[PDB]
Amino acid sequence: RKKIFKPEELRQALMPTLEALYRQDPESLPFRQPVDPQLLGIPDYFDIVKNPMDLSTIKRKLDTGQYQEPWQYVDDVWLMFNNAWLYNRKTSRVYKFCSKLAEVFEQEIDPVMQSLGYCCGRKYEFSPQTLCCNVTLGDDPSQPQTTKKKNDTLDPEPFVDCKECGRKMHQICVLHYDIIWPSGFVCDNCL
C-alpha cells in the first residue's frame, strides 16, 4: 500500500546531501541564511524572487518533519538555485557559486534517492527539447513565480506514479519502449 515517509527516514537519507552543499566554501556562503534585502542592499529582491529559499530553511524543514516525501526536498533545493540564477547575473559571483552548488547536488542526490526506492534524484530533463519551426506563476514548485529567444531551458523530467506505493518515478527512467503497463505502472520494489 501507500508509502509514508517518516521524518527521521527523510532526515537521515537527505541531510548528507544538504551537508555536501554546506561543505562548499566559498560557494555555500551566500546560501547559508535567508537573503536579507536591507542588509545586502538589494531592495528589488522580493520584486523578482516571490518565494525565497535557502540552506537554513531547508535544514529547518528536514529537522521539523515538514517534507512528506523527498521530491519536495529536491524541489526546494532547485527553488533555491533557480531564485539565485534569476536574481543574479551570469557573470556575478553568486550566480557562479550557485552553479557549483548545483553540480555538487546533481552528483550527490541520485544514490540517496535510490536508497529511498526511487529511480534517481534528477529534477530536469537532460537537454532542451527540439521545437517545431498577472498572479501566482506556478509551472512547477521550483520555478520562480511571475506576477526573440534561445532554446536553452530545461523542463522537469515527467513523472508516473507507482500505483502500489505512490512514489513518483520518471517516465524515462522506468517506462521502457518494449514494455506495456495496461493495469498501470508498478515500480520494481513493489513488483
Binding site: 551566500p30 545586502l40 528589488d44 529582491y45 543574479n88
Partner: peptide
C-alpha cells in the same frame, strides 16, 4: 529583468 546585484 535582472536585479541590481549583490
Amino acid at each position: 529583468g535582472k536585479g541590481l546585484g549583490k
